[PDB]
Structures are given as C-alpha cells and as structure tokens.
Amino acid sequence: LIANQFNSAIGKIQDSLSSTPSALGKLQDVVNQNAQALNTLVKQLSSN
Amino acid sequence: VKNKCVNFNFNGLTGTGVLTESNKKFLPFQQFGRDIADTTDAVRDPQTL
Ligand SMILES: *[C@@H]1O[C@H](CO)[C@@H](O)[C@H](O)[C@H]1NC(C)=O
C-alpha cells in the first residue's frame, strides 16, 4: 500500500507540474526581472 | 563593403559595425530597422535597395 501511494504521489506531482503553467513562477520572476533590468539599461541610452 | 568592421553613414544614420546580407523583408517605404530595445540592427541601402 505504501509503495502504491508513493508511486501515485509521484505521478500526480508530474501531472501537476505538466498541467499548470504557474508552478515555476519563482524562477520565471527572476528571469523576467533580470531581462527587464537589462532592457531598461539599454533603453536608457536613447535619452538626451 | 561587407563582412568587415567598418563605419557607415546611411542617409544620416551613422554607426560602426559589420554589414551582412539579411533575409528580412522591409515594406517599400522603411529605411532602417530597430530591435526591441530601440537599437539599430538593419539598414536599407539607398542605392541598391
Ligand atoms: C540612382 O538610384 C537608383 C535607386 O537607388 C539606383 O539603382 C542607381 O544605381 C542610382 N544611380 C547611381 C548610384 O549611379
């Protein structure tokens, strides 16, 4: 019973990760923040 | 001159870089392109289009 529960939990974890494009938001926020900071730094060159 | 690091002055657009043949397709009124961060990345030659 414990082995079956463990296997089912692992399968459900994979399914939850696959079918939810918001679980990994913590890394996505860091990537977006770095990219946006670089974009703002570059765009600051076009100011008099 | 292409494929070399050379200055350019294309219709008042001045800069330094390497000019290569591109696969982009400007509309027949645009003179030069830009990137997402407002950086010059492509130019239409005024004598060969
Ligand atoms: C005059 O302009 C046309 C259009 O750009 C170009 O094809 C032609 O070569 C020009 N004449 C020159 C550069 O002698």
From Swiss-Prot, chain A:
Q: What is the effect of changing D29N?
A: In strain: Delta/B.1.617.2, Mu/B.1.621
Q: Where is this region: Heptad repeat 1?
A: 1-48
What top-level branch of life does the organism fall under?
Answer: Viruses
Q: What does this protein do?
A: Subunit of the fusion protein that is processed upon entry into the host cell. Mediates fusion of the virion and cellular membranes by functioning as a class I viral fusion protein. Contains a viral fusion peptide that is unmasked after S2 cleavage. This cleavage can occur at the cell membrane by host TMPRSS2 or during endocytosis by host CSTL. In either case, this triggers an extensive and irreversible conformational change that leads to fusion of the viral envelope with the cellular cytoplasmic membrane, releasing viral genomic RNA into the host cell cytoplasm.
Protein known as: Spike protein S2'
The full protein's residues present here are 922 to 969 of 1273
